[PDB]
């Protein structure tokens, strides 16, 4: 009496069909309730969607599902994937026994949408310290979703992988990943070179 | 809502872990789940009322746990066990179900159990100002944040603008960075970002303050050694605009 669903992480582009494939073995009982939760980044557990009965549909947030009898499943599916829907999505099913309910979920399958950065300028930019001056930081901001920065070989310096940033008075949205460091001789212009950087990256002079 | 309590929990080896849930207001059915490190939910107990319908066999984790009249839920373990460092999450139902359709869900409780507390160290928080290069290029000014040197990874990140918190333009890594990759339990680096408007970074009248909340230790807790005792805290960078 079990469920499966796509192992992932499922990376997709921003307006990008998405299906998260659901199977399900009930052997209690020959209907059980569906459901898909879904948890948002640093946020509780809930409520995507719901089907208490079998061959019915059910809908939520653009996605929708079919209790579909014939082939067992419950998959979820959206048209325009949007980059809030980033979480991690776990389908459920629940069978009531015993007069108390009893709830199977799945492992879960992470789901993230990349924005499209529409007009982007990789730039790498060392800042300063507001009080001390112990080490320095950089910033590698604005460049494309496709570009992924690679953690840290030496020990003595710290890189973040990116982070999507939203300015919500215009639609700006723009990635950006930290790098810092105490190693003599570690420069801005080298933090990020064992990542592989958009050719035309702004490098200025601090 | 449901509510959880504590957040966060840091614990010595054998030392008990008391964890509180406030089901909504006329729901009876509250289960306990503990969610691993694999994104894997595991039953633990359910109390309708006051009564226990199942728990799980206690054969490899032992606890407590009661729902009593007027009083919130709570789940207890007693012989902290290194093997029972998880997210446990607390949810509530009317009774009804559908089966999970009424079933509402808390934020958790991540509770790590450690060997040695003299590993549990509070952040350092610096504040970074915007790159002149930044703002002469795209006129923006992004500020970061670098809280560096915490363990264990129980921290809460949050920006301050003019003494308001704020929300539009932050961003905050997912998750943490090993200082040490290469050690077990190595301490932890946390860096956000806060991407405001040129001429507002440029105005010296703007105060931008970083929050860093530490969880760890309790007053109601043995500390003999050298340095200040790790306890729950509140550490912060701040930095003003700069014309």
């Known amino acids: 009496d079990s469920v499966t669903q796509t192992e992932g992480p499922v990376t997709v582009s921003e307006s990008d069909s998405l299906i998260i494939n659901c199977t399900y073995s009930a052997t209690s009982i020959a209907y059980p309730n569906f459901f898909w939760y879904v948890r948002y980044p640093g946020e509780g557990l809930q409520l995507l969607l719901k089907v208490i009965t079998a061959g019915q549909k059910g809908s939520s947030r653009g996605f929708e599902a079919t209790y579909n009898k014939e082939t067992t499943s419950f998959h979820l599916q959206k048209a325009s994937v949007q980059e809030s829907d980033s979480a991690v999505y776990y389908c459920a099913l629940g069978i009531i026994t015993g007069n108390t309910g009893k709830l199977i979920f799945g492992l879960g399958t992470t789901l993230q949408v990349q924005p499209d950065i529409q007009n982007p300028d990789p730039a790498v930019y060392q800042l300063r310290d507001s009080k001390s001056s112990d080490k320095s930081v950089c910033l590698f901001t604005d460049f494309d979703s496709q570009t992924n920065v690679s953690q840290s070989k030496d020990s003595d310096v710290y890189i973040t992988d990116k982070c999507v940033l939203d300015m919500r008075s215009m639609d700006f949205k723009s990635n950006s990943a930290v790098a810092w460091s105490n190693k003599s001789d570690f420069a801005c212009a080298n933090a990020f070179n064992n990542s592989i950087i958009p050719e035309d990256t702004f490098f200025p002079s601090p | 809502k449901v509510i959880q309590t504590p957040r966060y929990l840091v614990k010595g080896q054998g030392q008990k872990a008391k964890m509180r849930c406030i089901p909504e207001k006329g729901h009876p059915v509250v289960f306990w789940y503990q969610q691993n490190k694999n994104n894997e939910f595991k039953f633990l107990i359910n109390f309708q009322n006051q009564e226990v319908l199942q728990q799980i066999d206690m054969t490899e984790k032992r606890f407590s746990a009661e729902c009593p009249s007027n009083s919130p839920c709570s789940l207890e373990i007693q012989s902290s066990e290194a093997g029972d460092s998880a997210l446990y999450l607390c949810?509530?139902?009317?009774?009804?179900?559908?089966?999970?359709?009424?079933?509402?869900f808390g934020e958790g409780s991540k509770l790590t159990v450690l060997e040695d507390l003299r590993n549990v160290f509070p952040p350092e928080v610096a504040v970074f100002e915007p790159s002149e290069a930044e703002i002469s290029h795209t006129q923006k000014a992004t500020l970061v944040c670098l809280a560096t040197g915490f363990y264990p990874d129980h921290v809460e990140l949050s920006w301050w603008v003019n003494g308001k918190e704020v929300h539009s333009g932050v961003c905050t890594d997912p998750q943490p960075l090993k200082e040490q990759p290469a050690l077990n339990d190595s301490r932890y680096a946390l860096s956000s970002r806060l991407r405001v408007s040129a001429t507002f970074w440029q105005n010296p009248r703007n105060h931008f303050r970083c929050q860093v909340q530490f969880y760890g230790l309790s007053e109601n807790d043995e500390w003999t050694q050298d340095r200040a005792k790790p306890v729950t805290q509140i550490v912060s960078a701040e930095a003003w605009g700069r014309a």
């Open positions: 949810a509530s139902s009317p009774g009804q179900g559908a089966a999970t359709g009424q079933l509402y």
